């Protein structure tokens, strides 16, 4: 099983073995995804920790500029988001799908993730090419708790 797959399944033994045999920790697949990205996408906290501790680069992006952060944000994997935020990744980066970590957190109704992003410097007034920001999206989708967190943050700034 590829290192990506071992990561996605949380197969700590086989994954730890493989990092010994070959230097493959940052090896990308066809879509530019690192094992770390696969681990983030599947909410494998233990694996994410293992990978970061063993040289995995959290800033590496997919072909469509996908990030480990946005992948974890989109699913509401709060514990992984914290870890990656603590790596010092950019919070405000866009991908080709026009999404940012905040927009994916908002889209998924992940209130805790939204709070965490905003506290890490994610800017809720940055817009997609369509002209809507994170507040707009929260209002559009009817996510009232998410709306309040964003509005509260904005209010404290002004």
């Amino acid at each position: 099983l590829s290192v990506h797959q071992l990561a996605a399944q949380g197969e700590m033994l086989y994954l730890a073995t493989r990092i010994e045999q070959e230097n493959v920790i940052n090896h990308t697949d066809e879509e530019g995804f690192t094992p770390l990205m696969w681990a983030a996408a599947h909410g494998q906290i233990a694996v994410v920790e293992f990978l970061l501790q063993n040289g995995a680069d959290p800033q590496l992006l997919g072909k469509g500029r996908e990030s480990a952060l946005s992948l974890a944000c989109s699913k509401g994997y709060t514990d992984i988001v914290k870890m990656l935020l603590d790596c010092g990744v950019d919070v405000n980066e866009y991908d080709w799908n026009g999404g940012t970590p905040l927009l994916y957190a908002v889209h998924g109704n992940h209130v805790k993730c939204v709070k965490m992003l905003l506290e890490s410097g994610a800017d809720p007034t940055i817009e997609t090419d369509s002209g809507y920001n994170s507040m707009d999206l929260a209002v559009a989708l009817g996510y009232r708790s998410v709306q309040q967190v964003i509005e509260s943050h904005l209010l404290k700034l002004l």
Binding site: E31, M37, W38, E66, L71, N97, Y104, H107, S130, G131
Partner: peptide, 11 residues
Amino acid sequence: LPTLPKLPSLS
């Protein structure tokens, strides 16, 4: 294959 949701896209 890890996937992100398609987000709203306005004309």
